[PDB]
Amino acid sequence: GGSTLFVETSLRRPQDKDAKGDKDGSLEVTGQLGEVMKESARIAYTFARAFLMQHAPANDYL
Amino acid sequence: VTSHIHLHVPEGATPKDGPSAGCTIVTALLSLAMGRPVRQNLAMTGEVSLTGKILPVGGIKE
């Protein structure tokens, strides 16, 4: 059958490692996912980054 | 020259003819760099050789 799953997210390290820090926002994924799933998650990650950029340039959270 | 980029080429190409996406990838990168969308209803295929020279490919009929 079909079900509903609550996809969850969290910030697993301090936001301000360095105010000048340029380290790209890493990603960690759970859910014993397959390789196609990993690529899909990476694609979604990049698109979310780009959309935030196109919408909220000031917010550098991602 | 100075920008981190993510490029996605959909799966499905047979291993041999996969490089046939060279010109497609190049034109996609150029379009992104200049933002000029490629002409509509257009397709391309073929290999690139680090210099601009292009090589034959197989499966033309398909």
Distance between first and last Cα of chain A: 35
Task: State the Cα–Cα distance between residues B17 and A5, nearest whole angstrom.
Answer: 39
User: Which residues share a beta bridge with B55?
Assistant: B47
Residue pair B18/B42 in contact by the 8 Å Cβ criterion: no
| CA–CA–CA angle B42, B43, B47 (5° rounding) | 145
Interface contact flag, B8 A43, Cβ < 8 Å: yes
Task: State the Cα–Cα distance between residues A48 and A21, nearest whole angstrom.
Answer: 21
Experimental determination technique: cryo-EM
Please choose, from the candidates A22, A59, A15, the residue with its C-alpha nearest in 3D space to the C-alpha of residue B4. A22
Distance between first and last Cα of chain B: 36
Please choose, from the candidates A60, A55, A58, A25, the residue with its C-alpha nearest in 3D space to the C-alpha of residue A42. A25
Residue B31 annotated among the catalytic residues of the structure = no
Instruction: HSE, CB side, 13 Å, CA atoms: give it for residue A62.
Output: 16
Closest chain B residue to A24 measured between Cα atoms?
A: B4
Distances (CA, A) of B3 to A29, B6, B29, B31, B33: 25, 10, 12, 14, 10
